[PDB]
């Protein structure tokens, strides 16, 4: 594996620093490294493919070095080089792709392909270098057994979940009390509704609560918390819990009362915020708990009083809500987020080559399914597969 990495920063820091002009002395430390490779290779036979729509191309080697020592790089030098790189490019592609489709439960955090199983070989180890690519940096630290770490803008930690829970309901669904929400990606919106506007509730206050359990701990999270759930602020006709009928939701929004957000880790409160809207920091948590209340307005102008009668029918449904968005965070496990193309790269290569569903990943690399049952095997395979996608993107986008 680490092998693989080099093969690239080799080419990038190559197809990039090697252009008509520059002095030799700008690549002395580079040229060398390069050659070293060619040698180790020359002679060894290879094969890639054998699955779905993936060609089976063979690769033979027999190349010379670069002794042409001329102060300044003359055009002629480049072309005689680019022609030798374009075989490694078109190669690596066919290499990444081959080990980017095979999966394994007996452990996938390891080489699978007849291409790579031969790379981890010892005689090839003579190649590694410049591991400043965020992903490899993390691959190593892991295979040595120690704390990892990655960066994400609008991470994708919440499997899609859009539902409701009726805490008080009746057949006619004309006097309900409960919550409805949408957990998806890095965002949570939750609304608490009480058709009776807490008319018979103790202290004329109805308590609500929404708990979300992350499948992985997030640390150093920058979060936006805002009152109101716009998504649940409009009239809706919804299916009943049993699917037998439909109910009507006609919200009128009030400010959430006694808002308390707790970011817990293993049941312990790590961060707690009382009615603080705007930007807040949650430094380490595996659970978010949002508690908020609907308090019947003690003083009401006529127009307001008219919405909340002492007796049914209750036609305007008092609703309070919250919106929470994780802008950025760090996770010790790889995850999809709103900026990185890893998930999309892996998913795209598999789709393009009609790769059959395997034993580890859900059909279509479905994110919701993956994060919902994020087993150790799926994570090890995902990390291997994400790290390869990142190696590939250094050369092929």
């Amino acid at each position: 594996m680490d092998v693989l990495y080099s093969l690239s920063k080799t080419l990038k820091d190559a197809r990039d620093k090697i252009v008509e002009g520059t002095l030799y002395s700008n690549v002395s430390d580079l040229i060398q490294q390069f050659n070293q490779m060619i040698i180790t290779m020359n002679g060894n036979e290879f094969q890639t493919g054998g699955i779905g729509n993936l060609p089976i191309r063979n690769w033979n080697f027999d190349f010379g070095l670069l002794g042409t020592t001329l102060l300044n790089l003359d055009a002629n030098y480049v072309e005689t080089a680019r022609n030798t790189i374009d075989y490694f490019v078109d190669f690596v592609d066919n290499v990444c792709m081959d080990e980017m489709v095979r999966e394994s439960q007996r452990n996938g955090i390891a080489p699978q392909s007849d291409s790579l199983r031969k790379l981890s070989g010892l005689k090839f180890k003579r190649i590694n270098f410049d591991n400043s690519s965020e992903y490899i940096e993390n691959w190593n630290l892991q295979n040595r057994r120690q704390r990892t770490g990655f960066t994400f803008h609008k991470p994708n930690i919440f499997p899609y979940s859009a539902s409701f829970t009726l805490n008080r309901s009746q057949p006619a669904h004309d006097n309900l009390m409960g919550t409805m929400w949408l957990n998806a990606g890095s965002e949570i919106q939750v609304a608490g509704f009480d058709y009776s506007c807490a008319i018979n509730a103790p202290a004329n206050t109805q308590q609500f609560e929404h708990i979300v359990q992350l499948r992985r701990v997030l640390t150093t999270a920058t979060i936006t918390l805002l009152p109101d759930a716009e998504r649940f602020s409009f009239p809706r006709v919804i299916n009943s819990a049993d699917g037998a009928t439909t109910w009507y939701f006609n919200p009128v929004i009030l400010r959430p009362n006694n808002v308390e957000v707790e970011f817990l880790l293993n049941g312990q409160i790590i961060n707690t915020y009382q009615a603080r809207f705007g930007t807040i920091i949650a430094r380490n948590f595996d659970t978010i708990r949002l508690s908020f209340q609907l308090m019947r307005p003690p003083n009401m102008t006529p127009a307001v009083a008219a919405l909340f009668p002492n007796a049914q029918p209750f036609e305007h449904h008092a609703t309070v809500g919250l919106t929470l968005r994780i802008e950025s965070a760090v996770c010790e496990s790889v995850l999809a987020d709103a900026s990185e193309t890893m998930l999309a790269n892996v998913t795209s290569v598999r789709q393009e080559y009609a790769i059959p569903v395997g034993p580890v990943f859900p059909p279509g690399m479905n994110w919701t399914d993956l994060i919902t049952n994020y087993s150790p095997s799926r994570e090890d395979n995902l990390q291997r597969v994400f790290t390869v996608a990142s190696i590939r993107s250094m050369l092929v986008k």
């Binding site: 027999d62 190349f63 010379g64 070095l65 670069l66 002794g67 042409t68 020592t69 001329l70 002629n76 005689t80 080089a81 030798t84």
Partner: protein
Amino acid sequence: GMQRMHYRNGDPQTPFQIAEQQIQNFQVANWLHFVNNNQFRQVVIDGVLNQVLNDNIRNGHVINQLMEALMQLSRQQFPTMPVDYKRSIQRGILLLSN
């Protein structure tokens, strides 16, 4: 500076060539194919039957092969072993050039 593995011939095909597939300096590279060819272009039937194997008009007077044989030489001046070496070597080469 190329293959510091000096070489290793048992008896393949055209031990002089083969170098082309593995040499990075075009000038050097043309010499090889041209020399590994110019098979004495054995095909002539003149002035009323005369199998007299001819050869490149190229060679003829178009000469250049020479000019190329030289230009390829004009860029072989580099390191590897003791100094009493390149010194003596390239100096000789130049005497071909001038």
